Amino acid sequence: DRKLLTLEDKELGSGGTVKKGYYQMVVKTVAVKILDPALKDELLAEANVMQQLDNPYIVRMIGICEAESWMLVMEMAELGPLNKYLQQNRHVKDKNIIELVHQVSMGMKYLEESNFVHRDLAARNVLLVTQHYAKISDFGLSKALRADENYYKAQTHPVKWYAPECINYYKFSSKSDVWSFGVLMWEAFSYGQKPYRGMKGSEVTAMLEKGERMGCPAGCPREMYDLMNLCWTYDVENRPGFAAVELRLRNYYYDVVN
Numbered sequence: 444d445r446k447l448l449t450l451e452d453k454e455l456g457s458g459g460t461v462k463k464g465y466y467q468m469v470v471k472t473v474a475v476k477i478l479d480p481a482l483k484d485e486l487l488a489e490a491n492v493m494q495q496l497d498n499p500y501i502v503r504m505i506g507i508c509e510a511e512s513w514m515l516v517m518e519m520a521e522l523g524p525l526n527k528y529l530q531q532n533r534h535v536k537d538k539n540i541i542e543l544v545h546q547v548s549m550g551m552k553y554l555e556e557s558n559f560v561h562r563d564l565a566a567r568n569v570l571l572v573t574q575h576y577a578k579i580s581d582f583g584l585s586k587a588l589r590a591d592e593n594y595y596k597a598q599t600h601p602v603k604w605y606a607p608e609c610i611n612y613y614k615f616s617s618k619s620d621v622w623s624f625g626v627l628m629w630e631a632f633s634y635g636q637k638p639y640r641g642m643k644g645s646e647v648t649a650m651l652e653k654g655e656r657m658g659c660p661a662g663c664p665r666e667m668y669d670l671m672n673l674c675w676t677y678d679v680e681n682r683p684g685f686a687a688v689e690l691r692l693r694n695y696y697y698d699v700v701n
């Protein structure tokens with residue numbers, strides 16, 4: 444009910460617009476994504492997925508608002524995109540970055556179990572509730588998998604976060620979200636640095652099929668860099684699943700705690 448939502452004149456970010464608002468339920472603070480007949484359907488589908496998901500480390504949507512424009516309203520994470528933050532806060536300890544990406548992998552594991560493929564997992568589409576609390580956002584590309592198939596198949600087509608099988612065969616699985624998570628891990632320990640800096644997506648694809656990968660980010664626990672590389676296994680069937688990844692993040696996290 445639109446009149447029970449208030450918005451800022453200014454925009455958190457852009458590319459339409461994203462805006463902070465307050466939704467009278469005690470008011471709760473909220474984020475709204477502000478938006479051709481196709482785009483409604485997308486925002487509306489984007490919203491259908493979120494509704495079905497229930498997890499600490501996934502952004503909770505409130506609902507959709509039909510008003511002046513088409514608008515999407517979610518439980519708001521004040522601290523914003525993980526990448527931008529990390530860039531502007533170099534003082535954050537690797538122990539905390541582990542904490543955060545274990546949270547994303549816990550969030551992704553739930554998503555796997557719910558047989559949904561994200562398709563846009565990246566450091567920009569992780570948001571911080573707090574500096575110790577991460578949530579995955581941006582389900583605009585997400586698909587619920589069929590009950591009898593482990594992958595979504597697309598038509599003609601973000602390249603630098605996508606596994607080879609996505610680039611060559613258009614197949615998006617939980618395992619391809621693992622590839623992206625790998626790039627998201629790289630981004631995290633490179634304090635918000637962009638991946639494969641300066642290259643064209645085509646060169647990136649040529650590089651990967653040569654067997655080459657990105658180097659270790661300064662300060663990065665070797666065990667985490669090893670995980671990045673298990674995540675970047677070329678063969679979809681040898682690349683670990685999100686259960687296997689989460690397990691390794693958890694086990695490793697505790698040994699660093701004390």
Ligand SMILES: Cc1nn(-c2ccnc(Nc3ccc4c(c3)c(Cl)nn4C)n2)cc1CN1CC(O)C1
Nearest residue numbers: 455456461474517518519520523524567568580581
């Ligand atoms: C679908 C969606 N949800 N959502 C959101 C949800 C909860 N809190 C917040 N807080 C928040 C969200 C976005 C922000 C900032 C803070 C800042 Cl600062 N800049 N930007 C773009 N934002 C943000 C988006 C669109 N963005 C493109 C990607 O970076 C996320």
